[PDB]
Every structure is written in C-alpha cells, then in structure tokens.
Amino acid sequence: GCRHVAIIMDGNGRWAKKQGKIRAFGHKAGAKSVRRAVSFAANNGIEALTLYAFSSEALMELFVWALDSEVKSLHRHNVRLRIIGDTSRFNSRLQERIRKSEALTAGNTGLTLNIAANYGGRWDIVQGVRQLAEKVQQGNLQPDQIDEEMLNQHVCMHELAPVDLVIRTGGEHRISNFLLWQIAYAELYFTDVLWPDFDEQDFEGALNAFANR
Amino acid sequence: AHGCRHVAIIMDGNGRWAKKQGKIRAFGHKAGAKSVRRAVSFAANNGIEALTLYAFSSLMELFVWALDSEVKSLHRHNVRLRIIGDTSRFNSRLQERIRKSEALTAGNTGLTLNIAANYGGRWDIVQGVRQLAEKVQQGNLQPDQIDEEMLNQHVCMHELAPVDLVIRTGGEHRISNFLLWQIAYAELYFTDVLWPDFDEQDFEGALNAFANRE
Numbered sequence: 373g374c375r376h377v378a379i380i381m382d383g384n385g386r387w388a389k390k391q392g393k394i395r396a397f398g399h400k401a402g403a404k405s406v407r408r409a410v411s412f413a414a415n416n417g418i419e420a421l422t423l424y425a426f427s428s429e430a431l432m433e434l435f436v437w438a439l440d441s442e443v444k445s446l447h448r449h450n451v452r453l454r455i456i457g458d459t460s461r462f463n464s465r466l467q468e469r470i471r472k473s474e475a476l477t478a479g480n481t482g483l484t485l486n487i488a489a490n491y492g493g494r495w496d497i498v499q500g501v502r503q504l505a506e507k508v509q510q511g512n513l514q515p516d517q518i519d520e521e522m523l524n525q526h527v528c529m530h531e532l533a534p535v536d537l538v539i540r541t542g543g544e545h546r547i548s549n550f551l552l553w554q555i556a557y558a559e560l561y562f563t564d565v566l567w568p569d570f571d572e573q574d575f576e577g578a579l580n581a582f583a584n585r
Numbered sequence: 586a587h588g589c590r591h592v593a594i595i596m597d598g599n600g601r602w603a604k605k606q607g608k609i610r611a612f613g614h615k616a617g618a619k620s621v622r623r624a625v626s627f628a629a630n631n632g633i634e635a636l637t638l639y640a641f642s643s644l645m646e647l648f649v650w651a652l653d654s655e656v657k658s659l660h661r662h663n664v665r666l667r668i669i670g671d672t673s674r675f676n677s678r679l680q681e682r683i684r685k686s687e688a689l690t691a692g693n694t695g696l697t698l699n700i701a702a703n704y705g706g707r708w709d710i711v712q713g714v715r716q717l718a719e720k721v722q723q724g725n726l727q728p729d730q731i732d733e734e735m736l737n738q739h740v741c742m743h744e745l746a747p748v749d750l751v752i753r754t755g756g757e758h759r760i761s762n763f764l765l766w767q768i769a770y771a772e773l774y775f776t777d778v779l780w781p782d783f784d785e786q787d788f789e790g791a792l793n794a795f796a797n798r799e
C-alpha cells in the first residue's frame with residue numbers, strides 16, 4: 373500500500389517554452405495538472421498527498437491565492453487541506469484566509485492534501501530545533517533527552533503516515549531541499565515528463581515502481 | 586572538469602552479487618572490499634576532494650575491524666581517513682584503533698575518505714541539535730539565533746565541500762537513512778550495477794553524468 377505520496381512538480385516553465393507560450397500559460401496548465409493528480413489520489417485511496425510548487429526557473433503567495441477558489445470543492449470532496457512552509461511573512465489577509473481554509477476542512481476524513489508554500493526541508497528541521505531550544509532555555513528539557521522520536525514530533529507532517537514515495541517530474545534528479553527528514557526511507561521516482569503533462573498513467577507508473585520495490 | 590568535489594556512495598548489492606554466483610555472503614563482502622579499494626583509488630586519481638562510503642546490504646563492527654587492515658595502505662596513498670557515525674558504544678579497543686587511525690592520517694593532503702559506521706542521517710541531525718541544546722543550556726546561545734547556517738556547522742562533514750553527487754548501486758531507489766541534511770541539493774544517481782561490479786568506467790559514467798546535468 374502506498375499511503376503518502378509527495379511530488380516535486382517541476383517543468384511548468386519548460387513546458388510553456390516548449391509550447392511556444394509565455395510562463396503564465398505553463399502555470400495555468402500546471403494548475404490543471406494539480407487538479408487531476410489530487411482527483412486521482414482521492415479516487416485511489418491514497419491517505420496523504422504532499423505537493424511542492426517548484427520550478428527550475430512572492431510567486432509563492434500568488435500560487436496559494438490561486439488555490440483559494442478551489443477550497444469549497446476540496447471540502448465537498450472530504451479533503452483535509454494544509455499549507456506547510458513559512459507563511460509568517462505572507463500578507464496578513466492571505467494568512468487569515470489560509471487559516472480559515474485549514475479550519476474549514478480540518479474535520480474532513482478523506483485525502484489530506486498538504487501544499488508546500490515557501491517550504492524547505494532544512495527550514496522545517498530548523499523550526500523544530502528552535503522549538504526544542506525554547507524548551508531547553510525554559511528548563512523544561514535536558515539536552516540529553518533530545519532523540520529522533522522527539523525531533524520527529526516537531527517536524528511537519530508528524531501526525532500523518534510516513535512518506536512512502538516521492539515523485540519528481542521535469543527531468544532533474546535532486547531533492548532540492550524539499551522534505552529531508554521525512555524522506556529517510558521513501559522510494560524516489562524520477563520522470564522526464566513535465567509537470568503539466570504528468571497524468572493518471574504517469575502516476576500509476578510511479579505507484580508500480582513502489583509496488584515492485 | 587567533472588565539477589565534483591564530494592561524492593557519497595551507498596554500496597549496495599554485495600549479497601545479491603554472491604547469490605548470483607552460487608556463493609555465500611562472505612564472498613560478496615570480499616568482492617565488495619576489492620571494489621572499495623578500486624573506488625578509493627579512482628577518486629584519489631581523479632581530483633575528488635572527499636568520498637564518503639556507506640556500507641549497506643538490502644557485521645558493522647566487523648566491517649570497521651576489516652578496515653583497520655587497510656589503514657597503512659590508505660596512509661601510503663596520502664588519504665585522510667575519518668569515521669562518521671555513532672561509535673560511542675563500540676567498545677574501547679575499537680574506539681582507540683579508530684582514534685589512532687584518524688590521528689595517523691589527519692596530516693594527509695590527498696583524498697579525504699569518510700567511512701560511515703553505525704551512521705544514520707536522522708542520528709546525525711539529532712547529534713547536531715544536542716550540541717546546540719548544550720550551548721543553549723550553558724546560556725551561550727539564544728534559540729532565535731539558531732538558523733540553517735548554524736545547524737549546518739554542527740552536522741557531520743560540515744567542514745568539507747558540500748556533497749555534489751550521491752551514487753547508489755544495487756538497483757534500489759532510496760536514501761535508506763544515509764545523509765539527509767547534507768543531500769538537499771545533491772545530484773542523485775542510481776544504477777542497477779551491483780557494488781562488486783561497479784568499476785572505474787561506471788564511476789567515470791556517474792561523474793560525467795553529474796558534469797552534464799549540472
């Protein structure tokens with residue numbers, strides 16, 4: 373069973389150029405590919421889908437704004453929506469809308485969809501270390517008590533199934549400081565397919581790799 | 586020219602290679618050792634600064650005993666040897682030989698060779714965090730001064746060139762809790778060749794793939 377899939381969605385800008393169009397056309401087709409992947413995962417019983425907006429190449433605030441009009445429909449589809457990443461300097465109106473959308477869907481029991489916005493795997497670790505360091509300073513924690521289990525409880529997604537499978541589209545063979553801690557034991561699947569062309573047969577191919585493993 | 590300063594290798598496939606031969610595991614480990622010597626020599630000869638090796642089969646303390654017999658040869662090839670991993674419960678005779686071997690070769694100016702022994706990427710992060718937490722408890726460090734650059738200065742190999750390329754032999758596509766923090770920007774190169782068969786032309790092929798893809 374593949375329970376939690378993460379995807380680095382690369383290739384939108386490259387796709388646009390290949391189609392003889394401006395960058396925005398690649399964004400729009402990438403967004404259609406997000407909808408199709410989220411639909412596929414919810415239909416195939418995947419528990420959690422984590423999507424990293426990234427291009428080989430403020431644009432992150434725009435990307436999250438564009439999701440705002442999809443929330444009513446995610447909710448109807450029993451999807452729990454979370455944004456992961458450092459949103460603490462987004463505009464306050466967008467922060468409040470993120471907070472409202474998360475709270476709206478927080479009770480849902482279908483697919484959990486994590487959208488990584490201004491996220492980095494080293495950042496994620498550092499935010500968990502800062503928390504532990506506040507506890508040490510307060511005298512609530514001994515340095516020698518800090519262990520893997522404890523750090524784990526302070527990194528993103530710790531309440532969800534372990535990441536089983538990471539897919540990167542677009543042809544590069546790197547993690548690019550997406551999840552680090554969380555991918556210790558995950559299957560890594562690289563495809564040259566550009567994100568806007570990545571479809572249900574491509575997702576199924578990746579799921580086969582994992583099942584062969 | 587290839588552009589790689591630090592290569593790290595997950596050396597998988599020794600058990601499979603011996604099973605293909607109708608031989609027991611020991612024979613794959615012996616062939617895997619011959620392939621280590623060959624890789625270390627190829628890296629030293631091709632301008633790599635650092636090579637970091639993780640012995641894995643999809644026994645530990647015995648791997649490191651085995652390495653002890655190679656230390657005089659590494660020294661003679663101007664290799665600087667370091668062990669990375671939690672060797673604190675290896676007992677004292679082993680720990681001491683480890684210490685003497687690092688001391689002997691620390692002055693060497695050729696390749697730096699890091700051998701993982703009882704190493705995990707999560708463990709490595711946690712040890713760094715514990716050093717930062719001691720500094721907080723001494724009153725020396727504020728939690729909000731802790732940033733990536735600072736945690737970077739506390740993980741294994743922080744003083745060496747960043748890892749540019751990770752090779753995993755043996756056909757599995759996974760990191761298996763070998764270096765996490767350090768591989769955030771590294772090229773990942775997976776090959777179905779089994780470790781004992783991975784030779785200079787395969788190593789050349791990985792470096793040239795990194796040069797072309799970077």
Ligand SMILES: NCCc1cc(Br)cc(C#Cc2cccc(C#Cc3cc(Br)cc(CCN)c3)c2)c1
Pocket residue numbers: 399400403404406407410411414434435438439442445446449451
């Ligand atoms: N006019 C395009 C505006 C735009 C720009 C950019 Br950039 C991004 C988007 C977007 C999006 C999006 C992001 C996350 C999730 C989804 C979804 C979805 C979804 C999930 C399920 Br389950 C079911 C449905 C209904 C259609 N099958 C839709 C859609 C939209």
Ligand SMILES: NCCc1cc(Br)cc(C#Cc2cccc(C#Cc3cc(Br)cc(CCN)c3)c2)c1
Pocket residue numbers: 614615618619621622623625626629647648651652655658659662664700
């Ligand atoms: N032959 C079986 C004994 C054995 C068993 C096991 Br398990 C492991 C080993 C090992 C090893 C090891 C570990 C780290 C480095 C090396 C090496 C080397 C080396 C490097 C250069 Br440069 C040159 C040479 C020999 C070239 N004259 C040799 C060898 C050795």
